[PDB]
Enzyme design. Sequence first.
Site, PDB file in Angstrom:
ATOM      1  N   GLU A 153       6.424  -1.170  11.343  1.00 39.03           N
ATOM      2  CA  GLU A 153       7.767  -1.390  10.808  1.00 39.03           C
ATOM      3  C   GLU A 153       8.261  -2.720  11.353  1.00 39.03           C
ATOM      4  O   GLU A 153       8.158  -2.977  12.559  1.00 39.03           O
ATOM      5  CB  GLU A 153       8.710  -0.223  11.187  1.00 39.03           C
ATOM      6  CG  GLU A 153      10.103  -0.225  10.501  1.00 39.03           C
ATOM      7  CD  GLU A 153      10.144   0.504   9.159  1.00 39.03           C
ATOM      8  OE1 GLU A 153       9.146   1.138   8.797  1.00 39.03           O
ATOM      9  OE2 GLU A 153      11.174   0.432   8.448  1.00 39.03           O
TER      10      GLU A 153
ATOM     11  N   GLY B  50      15.386  -3.571   5.322  1.00 40.46           N
ATOM     12  CA  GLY B  50      16.394  -4.218   4.498  1.00 40.46           C
ATOM     13  C   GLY B  50      17.457  -4.879   5.358  1.00 40.46           C
ATOM     14  O   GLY B  50      17.735  -4.436   6.493  1.00 40.46           O
TER      15      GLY B  50
ATOM     16  N   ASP C 146       0.811  -1.207   0.000  1.00 38.41           N
ATOM     17  CA  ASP C 146       0.000   0.000   0.000  1.00 38.41           C
ATOM     18  C   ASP C 146       0.854   1.271   0.000  1.00 38.41           C
ATOM     19  O   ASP C 146       2.077   1.209  -0.035  1.00 38.41           O
ATOM     20  CB  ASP C 146      -0.937  -0.011   1.190  1.00 38.41           C
ATOM     21  CG  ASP C 146      -2.374   0.326   0.818  1.00 38.41           C
ATOM     22  OD1 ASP C 146      -2.607   1.275   0.009  1.00 38.41           O
ATOM     23  OD2 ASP C 146      -3.272  -0.381   1.360  1.00 38.41           O
TER      24      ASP C 146
END
Lengths: 275, 275, 275
Positions: free
Chosen positions: B193, B170, B145
């Site tokens: 997150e 990452g 999204d």
Amino acid sequence: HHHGSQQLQNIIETAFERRAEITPANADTVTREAVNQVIALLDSGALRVAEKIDGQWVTHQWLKKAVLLSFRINDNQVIEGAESRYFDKVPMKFADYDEARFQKEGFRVVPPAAVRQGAFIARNTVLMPSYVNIGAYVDEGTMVDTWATVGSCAQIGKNVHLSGGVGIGGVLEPLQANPTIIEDNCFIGARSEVVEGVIVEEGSVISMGVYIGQSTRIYDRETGDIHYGRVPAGSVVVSGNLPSKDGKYSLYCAVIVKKVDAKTRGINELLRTID
Amino acid sequence: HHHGSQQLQNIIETAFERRAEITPANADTVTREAVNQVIALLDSGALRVAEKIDGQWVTHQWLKKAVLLSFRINDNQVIEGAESRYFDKVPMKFADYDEARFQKEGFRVVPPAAVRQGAFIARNTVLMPSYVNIGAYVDEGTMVDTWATVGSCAQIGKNVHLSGGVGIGGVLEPLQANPTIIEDNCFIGARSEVVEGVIVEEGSVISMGVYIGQSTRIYDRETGDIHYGRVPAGSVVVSGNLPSKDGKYSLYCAVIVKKVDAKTRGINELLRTID
Amino acid sequence: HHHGSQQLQNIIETAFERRAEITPANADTVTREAVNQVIALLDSGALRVAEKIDGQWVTHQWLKKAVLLSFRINDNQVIEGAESRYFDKVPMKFADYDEARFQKEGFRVVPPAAVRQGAFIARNTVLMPSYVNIGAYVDEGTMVDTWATVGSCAQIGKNVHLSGGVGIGGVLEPLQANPTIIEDNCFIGARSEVVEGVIVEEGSVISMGVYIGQSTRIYDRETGDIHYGRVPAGSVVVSGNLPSKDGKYSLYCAVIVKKVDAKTRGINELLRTID
């Protein structure tokens, strides 16, 4: 061809006092030229909205006045995109950059990162897709990660890491107030926001999801002291809450959970050693 | 035309050991060709940085080495935008895609979403404006999204929903560490997150504003157990705090407030049934 | 040339009942024309998904049906960018805007902000780089700050400030549910998210890092009352937690810490006067 720094300052200050009567149609040539030169100097890092002197942060209100006048004196125009079209009055920083100039200035701009003209980007910094607003200063060796924002007039130090989605709040008004400052060697964890002229001092480590403006309590758990507006150098800061007197609820705060000395100011290793 | 998977691995591993002496100017043809082929295979999903084997997550460090070498061997170049200009060394994924190839591969890319070359996007997925970084794998039927980020090497499963502003961290270094993994059928709520190689197991529901890295306590309120680095399959997870011993403050954590069985792993209906 | 509002409604409603059999290849001319006209009317603000009547919010399900049919009847096509390429079925709002039309409509679009066709943007509003999705209505004098999102069908009032990274959640399904609504004169602090048809009433001040959906407790600390789905007009709202019965943990909530009267509904000054 005409003005040095004191002249620019006076021209800007004088124009700012009478800004109510200045429009893009009627703005005089000298004012326009002075405003243009100030923006150019901010863009190159030759001037900066705030700077640390005798090891203290001083704010140049007149540079904010110049930025504000740049808005007053320029009309919005159509900005051709490819798949999208825009309509705005602030040009983009890299419109006239070629390979030689990017190589000279020494930073990377990863698409679709965008930067407004009037913002300085120093060598060895990497802009992942992000936004850097007018008046900002981003010093050497810094990472601005994906969907991060460097707000208007913000001062980002050397060797800073702004993680994904981190916002550094703009401060154009009030004129007298220092911009948001992240000093050298700071780590700011993902989704955090530092706003309203808060100063995060050198070597601090702020974890994910930490939100600090001037109203945010910064609780030193070791001493019980509460800080506002400043994260002392070397602080390790996480999100927490403080309980109400009735014990029925608690409210958001930042918590200093560790303090690292000057002679040592590993991110995961620091956060591991909590409690 | 030259190398299979074991050959590629050896060529990459050998080049990586001597990476200190490799520059964009001096990188040899065989190394460059091998690095290029590995990126192509990552891009197509034919190789993937981590994969689940005998129902366990195995990480291929050599694929991370290839990504890291791709950075070493390529110079930054000017990247023409329309209204903006960029300067970077990683090409974008869709530069050579035409209508036939987009139709064949079966996903949607909503402007201004961007994806670096070396990332795999599977059929029936929708990329709202978002970023997908090199090395990432995004499996079938998934929603990414608006302003979400899929970080480098991240593995996103099938039928995943990454809500607005969700970042998946990452992990290129350390080499040995698994990338961040979201298993099949997971919902991740807005502004959350998940970073640093945390694994969110199948059928989990993470609410809004939840931040989980390796240092984040994941509190199972039913048992009092604390998890790190893993959200067990079927967990419903919300933000909370744990109190300090002195009772003067509390610190951020994730809380498992519900556990859903394998044979059943409605989002609003689950979150409703709390307390 | 053919249909007024009641006709459009019937054509849309009738087509929606048989949507399972409608494809981009077989969609009839009348249905396509009606869907196109509804999108145009949403785009211009002449129709709106929800509106406040006799001072109450009414939702037009048929307008959501039209948006949903627009997806059904259009194929994805290649969308040429400059440095990036896209593949989607929804056109962008400003494709046919020239300088005269931008000047007439009276708002600013700061690159790389993007808006889908079928969304209304009123005069004196500023879109910093952000996303506005189909069906949204953004009223006069509003700021949509950097990396903010206005979701599908969302209604943003006049003189609203959506701070950096603020998401307003889309609501297309369920059809009957009101979209997310921010009433006039509201401030929403950075990184906050308001979703799932929550209504934030006029003159409210929401601080940073506040996440409110239908499952979020909104705790009125003055009374001990818990609200869901609605921030009463004039509320000042911050993040907090409520303690568990066992006292072993707490869970996330929003807290109303101040209430401002109608005859007065300064942001930093309000948040200062806490406790």
